[PDB]
Structures are given as structure tokens and as C-alpha cells.
């Protein structure tokens, strides 16, 4: 005799049941990094955030409807996010013939 079990998982995905994200990763700060806090992927630089959320708040938003702060799902601390540094270049020349 052999002890056997048959697993039968249904479909149609209307009653989302089990799933799993797992595979948490590490954290870094003050560098240009990609972040996937809760599937709201972005890129930028992390820092602290003195402002206080409400207990049920998850991630903030500023004027013009952009992400500005996110609470980490692990440590439950509201960090602040800033977009990556960038800019424009101007070239000053005194004359090719000179």
C-alpha cells in the first residue's frame, strides 16, 4: 500500500483564494534604485519622512497626483521618495574660427 493525495485546484479566477508573493528583498537608501513596495514600481531616491500618516494610510500623494511617500510593508515606517536627478546641458563657445 501507498498513501496518496490528489490535489485539485479550480479556475475562473473570480474567487481569488491563495496566491503568494513571498521572496522579500533587502532595503537601501540615498541611491538611485528601483522599488516595488507593493506593485507600485518606481525609480528614485529614498529617505525618511517626518510627516505622519493616519493608521490606515498606506502611501501618500502630493499636488499634481504623484507618488511622494510610501510606508514599508515590513518595518511599517513611512519613507519619502524623490525622483531621480536630471537636467539640461548648455555649451558655451567663443567661436570655431577663433
Amino acid at each position: 500500500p501507498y498513501r496518496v493525495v490528489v490535489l485539485s485546484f479550480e479556475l475562473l479566477h473570480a474567487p481569488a483564494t491563495v496566491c503568494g508573493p513571498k521572496k522579500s528583498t533587502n532595503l537601501v537608501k540615498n541611491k538611485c534604485v528601483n522599488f516595488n513596495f507593493n506593485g507600485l514600481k518606481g525609480t528614485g531616491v529614498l529617505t525618511e519622512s517626518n510627516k505622519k500618516f493616519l493608521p490606515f494610510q498606506q502611501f501618500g500623494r502630493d499636488i499634481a497626483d504623484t507618488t511622494d511617500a510610501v510606508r514599508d510593508p515590513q518595518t511599517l515606517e513611512i519613507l519619502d521618495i524623490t525622483p531621480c536627478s536630471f537636467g539640461g546641458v548648455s555649451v558655451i563657445t567663443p567661436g570655431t574660427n577663433t
Binding site: 534604485v33 528601483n34 522599488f35 507593493n38 525609480t43 514599508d72 546641458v89 548648455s90
Partner: protein, 49 residues
């Protein structure tokens, strides 16, 4: 003179993903570490959620 000609940015190098722990899990030990097993005709039908 002056000539606006170029645009620069700083690109990342690494990625980080986070999730709210694994506090709740699916108890499956009772299936494999079952005290006694079900008969051939008829069976236990355990619904997982």
C-alpha cells in the same frame, strides 16, 4: 553664444521589492501528517482558502 543641446539623467543599478511579511500561511501539515487516512470509497474533501 549658448546652445541648449543635451539632456542628462542618472540611471539606477539595483532593484528592491518588499511585502508585508509571511505572517499567515496555508496549513498543509495536517494533510501529510494526518493521524489517520480516508477510505477508498468516499473521501475527505478539504477546501483551502
Amino acid at each position: 553664444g549658448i546652445y541648449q543641446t543635451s539632456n542628462f539623467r542618472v540611471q539606477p543599478t539595483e532593484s528592491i521589492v518588499r511585502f508585508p511579511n509571511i505572517t499567515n500561511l496555508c496549513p498543509f501539515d495536517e494533510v501529510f501528517n494526518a493521524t489517520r487516512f480516508a477510505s477508498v470509497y468516499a473521501w475527505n474533501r478539504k477546501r483551502i482558502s
